[PDB]
């Protein structure tokens, strides 16, 4: 539940996050928050990091995602926590 | 987009589509059309069938999905064709 205004907020991913995004075909330095969430969701699915039985569970201890988030696993239900982890890995343009 | 009313339709996927959906952890035999679209999108991402450069292009000639749709590839922009191709593999409850 990222607000409509926040969706279009322009951001510059830090090096680790940018590396993650480009690994699934992202090809610029500047993105909207919405685009970051698109590619990040895509990444997790492409790497099959979600538990098949309970698909809110993401494992990432041996993955680049774990390095940049700084956690071994997380639940997609933890909205606040994920936003916090994402915002730590980018700079909001003109902040 | 597929209209909201067309996505709330309760459907029963045919064997081949059902196999595809269950291959990415889908549990049930009946779904809303919305749920089918969630799991199918997930499937395509999970098997990395999208073209890296032009990510609307889905290559399925070496995948179960190509047998299911009967095409070597398709574009996600072709909303009507995808709707039609999906519906050939569903029966309405």
């Amino acid at each position: 539940q990222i607000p409509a205004s926040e969706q279009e907020t322009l951001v510059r991913p830090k090096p680790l996050l940018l590396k993650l995004l480009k690994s699934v075909g992202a090809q610029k330095d500047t993105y909207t928050m919405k685009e970051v969430l698109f590619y990040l969701g895509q990444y997790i699915a492409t790497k099959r990091l979600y538990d098949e039985k309970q698909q809110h569970i993401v494992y990432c201890s041996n993955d680049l995602l774990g390095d940049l988030f700084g956690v071994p696993s997380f639940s997609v239900k933890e909205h606040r926590k994920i936003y916090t982890m994402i915002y730590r890995n980018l700079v909001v343009v003109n902040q | 987009q597929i209209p909201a009313s067309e996505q709330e339709t309760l459907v029963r996927p045919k064997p081949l589509l059902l196999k595809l959906l269950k291959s990415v952890g889908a549990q049930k035999d009946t779904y809303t059309m919305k749920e089918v679209l969630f799991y199918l999108g997930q499937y395509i991402a999970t098997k990395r069938l999208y073209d890296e450069k032009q990510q609307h292009i889905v290559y399925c000639s070496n995948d179960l999905l190509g047998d299911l749709f009967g095409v070597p590839s398709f574009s996600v922009k072709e909303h009507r064709k995808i709707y039609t191709m999906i519906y050939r593999n569903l029966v309405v409850v």
């Binding site: 919405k34 699915a45 | 889908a26 969630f38």
Partner: peptide, 11 residues
């Protein structure tokens, strides 16, 4: 629920 729906609800 699929991982695609959970992430969708997160977006």
């Amino acid at each position: 629920t699929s991982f695609x729906e959970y992430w969708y609800l997160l977006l």
